[PDB]
Design a protein around this ligand. Sequence first.
Ligand SMILES: C[C@H](NC(=O)[C@@H](c1cccnc1)N(C(=O)c1ccco1)c1ccc(-c2ccccc2)cc1)c1ccccc1
Ligand SMILES: C[C@H](NC(=O)[C@@H](c1cccnc1)N(C(=O)c1ccco1)c1ccc(-c2ccccc2)cc1)c1ccccc1
Lengths: 303, 303
Amino acid sequence: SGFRKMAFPSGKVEGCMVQVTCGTTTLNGLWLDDVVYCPRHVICTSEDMLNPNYEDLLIRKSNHNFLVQAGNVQLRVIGHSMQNCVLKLKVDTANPKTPKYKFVRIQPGQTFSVLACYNGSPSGVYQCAMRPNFTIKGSFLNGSCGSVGFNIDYDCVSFCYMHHMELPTGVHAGTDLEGNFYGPFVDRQTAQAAGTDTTITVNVLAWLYAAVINGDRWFLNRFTTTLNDFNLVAMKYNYEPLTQDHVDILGPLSAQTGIAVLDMCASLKELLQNGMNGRTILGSALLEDEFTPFDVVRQCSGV
Amino acid sequence: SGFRKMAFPSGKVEGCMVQVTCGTTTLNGLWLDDVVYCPRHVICTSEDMLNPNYEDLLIRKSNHNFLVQAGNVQLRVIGHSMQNCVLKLKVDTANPKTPKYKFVRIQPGQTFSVLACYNGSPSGVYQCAMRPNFTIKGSFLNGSCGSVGFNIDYDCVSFCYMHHMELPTGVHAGTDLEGNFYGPFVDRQTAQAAGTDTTITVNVLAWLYAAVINGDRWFLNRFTTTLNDFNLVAMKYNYEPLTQDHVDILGPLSAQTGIAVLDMCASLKELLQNGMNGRTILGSALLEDEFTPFDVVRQCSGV
Ligand SMILES: C[C@H](NC(=O)[C@@H](c1cccnc1)N(C(=O)c1ccco1)c1ccc(-c2ccccc2)cc1)c1ccccc1
Ligand SMILES: C[C@H](NC(=O)[C@@H](c1cccnc1)N(C(=O)c1ccco1)c1ccc(-c2ccccc2)cc1)c1ccccc1
């Protein structure tokens, strides 16, 4: 029993974190095979922040201008390219700690483990969700950039995120490892406001299912609801519209807890309409939406 | 900016997690040098749970009865011993991924990263605190036992916890790597009730200091208090008595935020007396006490 904000083991990803220096600017790179992926804003200077032209900013840079350091060891950059908002620095040496890996682009509401890094050094690990506004409520300081979000499918590290920037609102924006920012964010120092941060309803339901599985069942009522009636109250509370997919995705937890998904929607409604009445669920005084149905299954089947 | 429940990178500890089978029973072992540490209740059977005699239960067991598996590779157990509530299984092979390491016994209120394991396989990572009742509110399933809590001092993994058992209350009890349970817990299936789970006041203050550093400063009042007056209200709310050490330990955060520690105690008092009024601090609707002053410094200086 028990339920915590759990990350994947970062070991496989630690062995991939290198330091990437471009002049004054230093941040993290991901070293897989003979390629080091980092935010392309490594190349940007003290005044390039506002409107940097990267193609233009790349011409000025060469292989020897990218100082790729793997712990204490400098790597030979034997070729570089820009893919969207990432640099792919070709190095002469394949990373011998390269795990089996994929670059997935993760849907909003999906979760991943962040290995926060400074100077290619793993600092800490924490679970994150892709917010429906395609921000992530991370912990990143200066130099945290090029830190990756990831998911482990047994042996296979599925890199879903590379951290780029903090928004004016303490919130984080970054890209997949193909360099495509999640959301409308751009690697420039301009007015970039977050959209509405909606609650990942299916995740809250999964969290409630985790709560019930861990004996926190108080918020259960004798009520049911309809998807449509629940979704009316969901929208009022800035909750993601719930779909049959969400219900299907919660089927495992339903089947596990013998609680129809719509009876849990009924409990969620009462929690949303009435608040939590000073009570806690899974040591939280609000409804956690940064655990997927898969995350709950994982943390309650011990994958 | 941003503030999350961050763990240390588990990589150094992953390379130390082995599987430990004794007959039907399987759990995790920690492989450092030529020694594999696991909960001694690995040796206990289907009826030994109630009152097991371990010395007696060890006689029946030999080196070849301890199946130490490192991934797909069995290790030769060339000697075994019991140290308090841990077995130290001597193996012929030093763990080549042995990090620089110490066994620290951590004070209650101190935090550590848990690498949750099943069959010597890292499942997930999360930050934990030693509760003042010497329980830990973990996420551990069946077979999670022999999972270690730890702290990383740059290169040096300070193993503080080995997970043993879940209490009747969904809460977790275990030992240091010298095998000494934190708290009054014993590796037996008997009435083991948690004491009062008091709030780690110094940690809540650190969390508030992290909140203020991350722009969440609303709970700041124009009030101050005295240690004694604050401690009167602390005790009412089952908060750890605050000491000059706690104030000293918060000195860094005080100095960083230019907020006297006692003005923050004043804010904590108003939060405790008045609750949070539906408001959140650092995405929490209650006062987080599972972040140390050191943890906040670390996550807000990027160590
Ligand atoms: C306010 C925000 N502040 C930041 O983003 C902070 C940073 C703070 C904490 C966590 N995450 C990143 N930041 C870093 O820590 C960093 C810089 C280099 C390596 O790391 C950074 C600074 C600059 C850039 C950048 C520069 C040129 C062109 C385009 C972008 C990118 C990141 C920001 C600054 C500038 C632009 C957008 C957002
Ligand atoms: C209720 C509790 N249930 C548990 O503790 C669960 C377990 C569940 C989730 C997380 N953490 C551990 N548990 C395991 O997952 C496990 C067993 C072996 C390897 O792993 C376990 C079962 C048994 C023992 C044990 C056996 C003989 C003598 C003394 C102790 C120890 C652990 C418990 C059972 C028995 C005794 C105390 C507490």
